[PDB]
Design an enzyme around this catalytic site. Structure first.
Site, short mmCIF file in Angstrom:
data_model
loop_
_atom_site.label_atom_id
_atom_site.label_comp_id
_atom_site.label_asym_id
_atom_site.label_seq_id
_atom_site.Cartn_x
_atom_site.Cartn_y
_atom_site.Cartn_z
N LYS A 276 0.77 -1.15 -0.22
CA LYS A 276 -0.05 0.12 -0.01
C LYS A 276 0.81 1.38 0.05
O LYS A 276 0.64 2.24 -0.78
CB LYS A 276 -0.89 0.02 1.33
CG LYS A 276 -1.98 -1.18 1.29
CD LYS A 276 -2.94 -1.04 2.43
CE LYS A 276 -2.13 -1.31 3.77
NZ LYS A 276 -1.61 -2.60 3.88
N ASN B 128 -1.63 6.61 6.18
CA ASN B 128 -0.83 5.68 6.95
C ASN B 128 -0.77 6.26 8.48
O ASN B 128 -1.09 7.31 8.63
CB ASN B 128 0.46 5.45 6.52
CG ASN B 128 1.28 6.89 6.44
OD1 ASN B 128 1.14 7.58 5.33
ND2 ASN B 128 2.49 7.04 7.20
N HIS C 68 -3.88 -10.65 9.44
CA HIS C 68 -4.87 -9.70 10.32
C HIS C 68 -6.10 -10.58 10.97
O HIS C 68 -6.76 -10.07 11.26
CB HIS C 68 -5.28 -8.57 9.73
#
Ligand SMILES: Nc1ncnc2c1ncn2[C@@H]1O[C@H](COP(=O)(O)OP(=O)(O)O)[C@@H](O)[C@H]1O
Ligand SMILES: [Ca+2]
Ligand SMILES: [Ca+2]
Ligand SMILES: [Ca+2]
Ligand SMILES: [Mg+2]
Ligand SMILES: [Mg+2]
Ligand SMILES: [Mg+2]
Length: 439
Positions: free
Chosen positions: A115, A138, A183
């Protein structure tokens, strides 16, 4: 949107939560803030007037709120938030607040890995066109800090967690770069639940930039007229390898020889393709976007060539803290001689099995270290050595390297068993590579 007179409660005192505090104060609203940490770092940036509660969540504050602004670091599934939702209290995140106020087009980027590289690269494409572009999302540059009437384009890195609390994003171009098993503490129903969060990025997007090699990046109801693909072997944007060279190819036409770029690695070439697709879709001129591809240096610790000497390339991929990152480093990897691969650290119970596929061949040596070194050596013991530390592993391999070799630090693990953070690990690797391979 108008928040005057509302009881606003923010969860999180990291930089994201602080950016939300500033947002409301700038609008004449004094929010309340809470954080489960007793002494969050942002405490001593708060103004006196902001009521705060630390060391736990304050349920009565949540249940009294007109609006709850949840850090991405707490799950909608947390019992306090579920109770607030059950009561009908509106729960948003920082990105939702941003999308309601943004007055320039938004390029939105999510995915398991890549990303920040792709976000930064699209930002450089905009800068090369002379656009006053705002790049962020971010944790180091929260999106709300970008809001400005002078901004002409926003380029946001968005996590799955942020997308869960966002309903108002209308991206001019959006991508899911890839989806890999990570995650999973936050997604107890597995890969398709993690995917569902990311799939929100395509809702009301004008153009969807999808990964032709990763079907989980396709929109939920399938490919549609909005979709543009990037990929290795085929797609609207893909890679062409012929007669020893590689070109970026767009709609059947070579556009750039990758030798003009400063980035290395097939996955960085597909990152360049995704970025170009997003920039094209956003209306940025093609010529300046290609110029940016020739000047973009890449980000530190992302498959970063820190030394090329005596025919040996020493590559700092310290930010490969998970298996998906290292798998992408190894896939399509170009090495004339031997790959000396440094794996190690705290692997956080990962399944390393996927890496085995790439570890056959008579031109691979493994050097495994840190907490989980023995598990990594087990991928293929006959070509593996195990040490306690990265420095020990580098001193083992240094006298063996020959022109044509690659020394790749792509640990597939967190660094915290032995280092302060992955930047310290990568900086130490760069120091040792120069000591051991520079002469
Ligand atoms: N497209 C990709 N697929 C898989 N891994 C990638 C990709 N792009 C970069 N990586 C690797 O993932 C790690 C993090 O890259 P980065 O661009 O910081 O991603 P993010 O911002 O999503 O954490 C680095 O090891 C990098 O080489
Ligand atoms: Ca918290
Ligand atoms: Ca040992
Ligand atoms: Ca780390
Ligand atoms: Mg990032
Ligand atoms: Mg495939
Ligand atoms: Mg463990």
């Amino acid at each position: 949107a108008d928040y005057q007179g509302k009881n606003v409660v923010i969860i999180g005192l990291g930089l994201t939560g602080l950016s939300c505090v500033d947002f409301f104060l700038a609008r004449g609203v004094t929010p309340r803030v809470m954080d489960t940490r007793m002494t969050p770092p942002g405490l001593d940036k708060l103004p006196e007037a902001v009521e705060r509660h630390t060391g736990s969540l304050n349920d009565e504050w949540l249940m009294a709120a007109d609006l709850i602004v949840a850090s991405p670091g707490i799950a909608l599934a947390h019992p306090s938030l579920s109770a607030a939702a059950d009561a009908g209290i509106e729960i948003v995140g920082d990105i939702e607040l941003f999308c309601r106020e943004a007055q320039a087009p938004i390029v939105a980027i999510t995915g398991s890995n890549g990303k920040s590289t792709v976000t930064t690269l699209v930002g450089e494409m905009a800068k090369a066109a002379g656009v006053n572009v705002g790049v962020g999302g971010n944790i180091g540059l929260p999106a709300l800090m970008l809001l400005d009437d002078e901004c002409e384009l926003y380029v946001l890195e968005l996590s799955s967690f942020q997308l869960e609390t966002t309903s108002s994003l209308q991206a001019v171009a959006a991508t899911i770069l890839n989806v890999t098993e990570d995650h999973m503490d936050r997604y107890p129903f597995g890969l398709q639940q993690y995917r569902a969060a990311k799939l929100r990025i395509y809702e009301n997007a004008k153009v969807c930039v999808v990964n032709a090699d990763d079907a989980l990046t396709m929109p939920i109801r399938g490919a549609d007229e909005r979709c543009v693909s990037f990929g290795v072997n085929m797609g609207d944007y893909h890679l062409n390898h012929q007669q020893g060279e590689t070109w970026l190819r767009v709609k059947g036409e070579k556009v750039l020889n990758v030798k003009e770029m400063k980035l290395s690695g097939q996955h960085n070439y597909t990152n360049a393709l995704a970025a170009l697709a997003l920039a094209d879709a956003a209306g940025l001129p093609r010529a300046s976007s290609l110029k940016a591809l020739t000047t973009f240096t890449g980000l530190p610790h992302r498959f970063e060539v820190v030394l090329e000497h005596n025919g040996v390339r020493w590559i700092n991929d310290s930010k490969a803290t998970n298996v998906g990152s290292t798998e992408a480093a190894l896939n399509g990897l170009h090495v004339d001689g031997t790959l000396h691969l440094l794996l190690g650290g705290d692997g956080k119970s990962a399944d390393f099995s996927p890496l085995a596929r790439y570890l056959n061949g008579d031109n691979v040596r493994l050097y495994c270290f840190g907490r989980d070194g023995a598990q990594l050596a087990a991928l293929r013991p006959e070509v593996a050595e195990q040490t306690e530390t990265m420095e020990q592993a580098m001193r083992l391999l240094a006298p063996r390297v020959q022109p044509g070799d690659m020394v790749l630090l792509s640990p597939a693990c967190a660094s915290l068993d032995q280092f302060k953070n992955f930047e310290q690990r990568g900086n130490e690797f760069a120091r040792l590579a120069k000591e051991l391979g520079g002469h």
